[PDB]
Design a protein around this ligand. Structure first.
Ligand SMILES: [Zn+2]
Ligand SMILES: [Zn+2]
Ligand SMILES: [Zn+2]
Ligand SMILES: [Zn+2]
Lengths: 356, 356, 356, 356
């Protein structure tokens, strides 16, 4: 008989609480695509949320969907039109690839393209599996001194890069980060790398703040039941001034309100967290002091920069990885994520190499 | 006996509903100030509001305050250090003058300076009187082909200039302006002067919209009881697309919500109207499509630009003046403003010249 | 016998002074391309230059090349993947279409993409012919109230739009335009549309300046043998101040030098003309007054905006068309261009419709 | 007899090669000025050049001028209107203080103000003396953990901050710095602090490059007689790509040419060095790839940011000081500067404290 064919075991969400490991066909790359032997894939709240509620806002799972969107792997095969990538190349994968060159792509903000393909956001299948095909322009070669897990960490790191950019974070800035979860952490890492003089991070958990301290947070503030004004007051009390930029990573109404009150006049409040459809905020306060309120939707043009920072050892994201499981233990990985302990959980999809 | 001294009759608000015409001492200009013989002064909701409620937000009249802040006049005397102005110069007066060169002034956003002096905003006396002294750097010479009233209109025009600038209005844009009151009208004139392809104005009053058409509105939409989503749909229906910029001039929650829904992704929603301390809005919607929410606080660096536009006949604000009264008929002018009929009302403070 | 097949008569440059009208095969559109029945094509110095010297700098004609790059036409057929365009649509054609989604395209500056395809720039064939295929994303639908010739004029107009953008031209600006040739003219049109208060245009020809006056130039200055300093002096003498932006459209060294001397501190000097490989300029002068020197290479993201301006009658480019010949009289059209009289010469490729 | 009066020994340049130490009257601070007891003052090519040639470009010493402009000191007395400073405050002095609030100051670019006062640039006296008065808004309080010498180093550091800002240096960038002199070194430190992934420094001296390595240069390239094109090739060869930003610090024509050839398309070439009045450069090359050429004139809005960076230990400029002499040994200090050996030389003006 013929030799055994390769498999494409995949982690699939069928509905709320219905997670399964099942085999999928092996993708065939189009002329401008590459087939990747998946290596490392980190998971975040969006994967867990789809698993728990089968949806996130209007993005709802209407049919079985493969999870995973923060990954790296090895090029297995390339399409006829691919020139910059060859079999064997280690690459980082940017999950958002435009389907059409609309005005948003031409102006340089492809992340806003309405018909964009995005891994693990229904109805687009993610990459928590063995073999995955992706647009070649959105697969970036990893330098030899950058690990697969670092390559996978580029996705969450890019959320922080995009956020700091939109906020205008720069040399000597005093930056406030609301939330010490993984989003706030990468945001902290980026702010410092961009030259922020002081970064103050707030959170409900003293443990998370302790970890924030470990990776660079200049100041931490544990929040309990203080009002938004009191929070802003305490923040300013610690800095000796008002932060020029605030990056809200919790999505909670009270925190958003605190950011408006805390941010220096002419500064920027970036909203990265996702909360309710409606939020009650002191717009009048913001307008009078020209505190801009800018939202963030994923990212654009961050991979090459993230790779340069990692290759030059300008940032250290490794401490963010707290657990790693082989793809086959995906369910245990998700149950672990739910326990709220840790920061970034990594899934190892390549049986031939389970290392970082 | 000696010759009669000049007088300095002033319109003063002593408290809610307490408006009086009384004589004030004649100001003496310091080294970097000039004394102006007031000529034309337009009034707006702010003056009228301080009269009715004795306050606007946290800005409250604690002692009698002279009203007026949109003016022009003639230089009567100059301080020992003034060199760009001499007696007889016709000038436009920018009401906001910084008291100290703090970081806001140095960075170029002096309007945000915390200790800024501003005419007719408690506790700073306005210029609805005969003689007024002001910082010479904030008094701009008017070209011969620009009238005193045009000079006075620079103040309200600058609100529109600052708003369109913050919104990023530029060549070819489709702009939505919520509110056809005087603020919306100047915003309309400025947007067109900046190259906007089409400006659509909304309002509750059919009469105000008709006037909007008269000065350049490409499209108008009268609003009754439609929902924010409906408003957004109607606007897009008329433009054939979503406007890149929305300038909200009413301050109403419903209108602000319509702006978020209507604005094109990656676009900007400018908040010029002043409403409630709190506003319930769909921030999530705005964040997902990166629709920025920028507030505005008066203006900075608009006088020279305004003068060049008027001097070159690039914009015409004359149609905005619907009534003019001599200073002595100030009460009648304020009663007229309440009638809600009309656009801009001008007060003439110089008895020797009541002309435009 | 079968019915007669359509022809694809094309204007081809074989070498210096070797211009021919010959039949080409009829292009077949790929999945993301459209086939256009060419209608109107304007010609400029680059077409004439390739004809005269068979090259422009390093861009050299190594094999017969079809000329033409400023055009519009009617969609004849669409590729399998085209959704936004159907047979019969009248469209404007943007000649520069990227071959790969490199970092320049992702950042929003696709014009800088190294491997970009560009009509009539060797070795890419242009569109002065009957049928031409082009990337569908770069073919824009023309509104009914916009003529084919206006659609073709979008290309040269876009040179002006891009130039004013890079220069930062905005409301109330005083702008200097060196050169009253067709480039300077569209630049003049754009500057005014963006809100420039005064535009001063210089040139060696009094006739060209007279035409500039006809289309909006606020001030004109005929240049003879004056030195760069004297030019700057005269320019400032006319404006009463220094222009915040200078757009050099001749490429001549002396003019570039005058622009540096004339431009206001902190302003911008945009280089649109093409001269020698080397230029001697007073960089020290520019640096001390922070006068930025920015080059321009064609354009990016201008078509939709140009179309909006034309459809709303915000700009009038029609006066630029001074002559029109059918494709078959292409040689006469080129000999006419060489006579230096006129501004824009239009070629009509569709025998069924030779109107504007 | 009465008590001995304090002295105000000053280092004065009377003409080419004529340097003297002589006593000056003690300044009396005006209402918005402060009198400083000078502590640390670093010197640079400008002071040394005024000494050797009695001029720099059009800036010429027409009467004896006190040298020095990179300093810090202690507040000895404050004007009747000063409120943010009191006797005893340790402060950093920003040498450039505007004499009038013109359009340049209002727009936020006060360094361009035509009538600005600037220490040690004829005809304005510098601060290499015992007592010096300055505008209070331009004297910044130093935190306790920042030394006087660090305060004095803010001046040269700000040249680098302004240069990197104008160049747009940001996260992940590959930056080329031409020249390893003190300007190139601070530029290097700032570029890294701003998040540049790799900074490559070029220079004629192998010794200066070794020092560059010591403070953070990722790569160094010694230049001998290669051509500009060759230099550009070598730089790219080492980076593996073209740098997005080039900061030219020598002022040499050949070097400026290399910068144009080396800089990535759409990138920026910042000219910090001062060379000849005229420079022959390949503008065409720069325009075709939209490589912007921006000059710089000192700085604006950098002191507060510099202080925050030093106070947070985000940058370390201490390694720049290679020698320190008391004011009285100024001649020896200037002779040492000519030796070309060393980086930054500090003069100690306060006899009661000669420490860093
Ligand atoms: Zn994620
Ligand atoms: Zn008003
Ligand atoms: Zn052309
Ligand atoms: Zn210096």
């Amino acid at each position: 008989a013929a030799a055994a064919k390769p498999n494409n075991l995949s982690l699939v969400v069928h509905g709320p609480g219905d997670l399964r490991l099942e085999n999928y066909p092996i993708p065939e790359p189009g002329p401008n695509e590459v087939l990747l032997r998946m290596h490392s894939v980190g998971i975040c709240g969006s994967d867990v949320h789809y698993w728990e509620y089968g949806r996130i806002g209007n993005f709802i799972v209407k049919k079985p969907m493969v999870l995973g969107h923060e990954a790296s792997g090895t090029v297995e095969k390339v399409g006829s039109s691919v020139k910059h990538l060859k079999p064997g190349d280690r690459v980082a994968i940017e999950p958002g690839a435009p389907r059409e060159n609309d005005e948003f792509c031409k102006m340089g903000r492809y992340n806003l393209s309405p018909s964009i393909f995005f891994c693990a956001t229904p109805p687009d299948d993610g990459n928590l599996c063995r073999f995955y095909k992706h647009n070649a322009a959105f697969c970036y070669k990893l330098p030899d001194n950058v690990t697969f897990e670092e390559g996978a960490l580029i996705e969450p790191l890019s959320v922080g890069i995009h956020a700091c950019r939109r906020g205008g974070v720069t040399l000597g800035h005093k930056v406030l980060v609301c939330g010490a979860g993984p989003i706030g952490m990468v945001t902290l890492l980026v702010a410092k790398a961009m030259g922020a003089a002081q970064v103050v991070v707030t959170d409900l958990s003293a443990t998370r703040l302790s970890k924030a301290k470990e990776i660079g947070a200049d100041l931490v503030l544990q929040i309990s039941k203080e009002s938004p004004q009191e929070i802003a007051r305490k923040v300013e009390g610690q800095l000796g001034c008002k932060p020029e930029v605030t990056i809200e990573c919790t999505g909670a109404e009270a925190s958003i309100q605190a950011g408006i009150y805390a941010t220096r006049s002419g500064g920027t409040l970036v909203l990265v967290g996702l909360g309710s459809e409606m939020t009650t905020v002191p717009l009048l306060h913001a307008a009078i002091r020209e505190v801009d309120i800018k939202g963030v939707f994923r990212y654009c043009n961050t991979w090459p920069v993230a790779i340069s920072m990692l290759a030059s050892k300008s940032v250290n994201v490794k401490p963010l990885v707290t657990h790693r499981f082989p793809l086959e233990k995906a369910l245990e990985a998700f149950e672990t994520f739910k326990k709220g302990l840790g920061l970034k959980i990594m899934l190892k999809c390549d049986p031939s190499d389970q290392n970082p």
